[PDB]
Amino acid sequence: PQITLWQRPLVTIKIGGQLKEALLDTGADDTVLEEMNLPGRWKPKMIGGIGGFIKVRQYDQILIEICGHKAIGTVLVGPTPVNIIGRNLLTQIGCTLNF
Amino acid sequence: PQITLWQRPLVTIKIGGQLKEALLDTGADDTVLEEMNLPGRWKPKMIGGIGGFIKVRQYDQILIEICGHKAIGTVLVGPTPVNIIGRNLLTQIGCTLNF
């Protein structure tokens, strides 16, 4: 599809059998999702924010559907205020920026 | 141009005759720029991130040129490590996401 930017580019995603909303973010290297029960192996990771660090769970080789398109990649799961789909998955669905 | 997302979508912007690098960020409502000297009046503002808020200065009606497109809009100036072009300007240059 063509997504315009008059509104936030929020789309439906499916991951671990669950539907959620997530922001397509060309500025993000990485994909960060709200706390969530996900099966499988993960690695602990720390990220430094404004007031301090957050701990997240890194899941690699995860299958995620983004606005209908299947994609495989790394997702970080933790206390984020918004679900962010970053470039690591946007490339996998063939997403381009056009103007 | 058409921009793939395998690398950060960094472009050159022109603001007050100066050339700076900035990131085209579909996930950002607003445009946020590093400490610089813009002329005239501003309004104090707060932008939220992980674990807190950053103080910024909001300037209206600023001319920014991006890949030949001339946008006029609101910019937030603050201690951002990266210049962020948000949807307020991305919509003015005709930017869409496509996959």
């Binding site: 430094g48 | 990131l23 960020d25 991130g49 950053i54």
Partner: peptide
């Protein structure tokens, strides 16, 4: 690295 979350 997610600039809108101020994460780098």
């Amino acid at each position: 690295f997610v600039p809108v979350l101020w994460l780098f």
